[PDB]
């Protein structure tokens, strides 16, 4: 909400200690878990399937997204942000997003989906979008040529 509270959360992730409400759909099986095109379709799968969405808050602290419901109070995606395959917002066409984890401790290429609670690309998009910032703040990511 412009300079005020948004300035706080933007810094929270920097120090690893943020959070935002959301309805984390669930998890699905995939043959990639390392891209963006898989997230766009993965989310769709979370629906067609029986992956009922939770009603809690995503514990984002620039280290590992730990989504937890507000009913059962149980961790769903207990994975590290540095180890996980990272997130990739669908297409910001309706405030939709989706994570991804290369097996690790989730069996196999497990695709994830979570639609922002407030729904306004101003709670999870910029929140988790920075969550990784702390991971590769110096853009350690090796995707381009670099120099």
């Amino acid at each position: 909400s412009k300079p005020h509270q948004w300035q706080a959360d933007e810094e929270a992730v920097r120090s690893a200690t943020c959070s935002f409400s959301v309805k984390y759909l669930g998890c699905v099986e995939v043959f990639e878990s390392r891209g963006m095109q898989v997230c766009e379709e993965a989310l769709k799968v979370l629906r067609q399937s029986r992956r009922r969405p939770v009603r809690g808050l995503l514990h984002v602290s620039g280290d590992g997204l730990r989504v937890v419901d507000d009913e059962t109070k149980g961790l769903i995606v207990d994975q590290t942000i540095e180890k996980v395959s990272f997130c990739a917002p669908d297409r910001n066409h309706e405030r939709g997003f989706s994570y991804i984890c290369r097996d690790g401790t989730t069996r196999r290429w497990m695709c994830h989906g979570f639609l922002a609670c407030k729904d306004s690309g101003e709670r999870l998009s910029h929140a988790v979008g920075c969550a990784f910032a702390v991971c590769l703040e110096r853009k350690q990511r090796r995707t381009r040529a670099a120099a």
């Binding site: 997130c87 853009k139 381009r144």
Partner: peptide, 7 residues
Amino acid sequence: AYIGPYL
């Protein structure tokens, strides 16, 4: 986007 959908 930023880091995820790119880096």
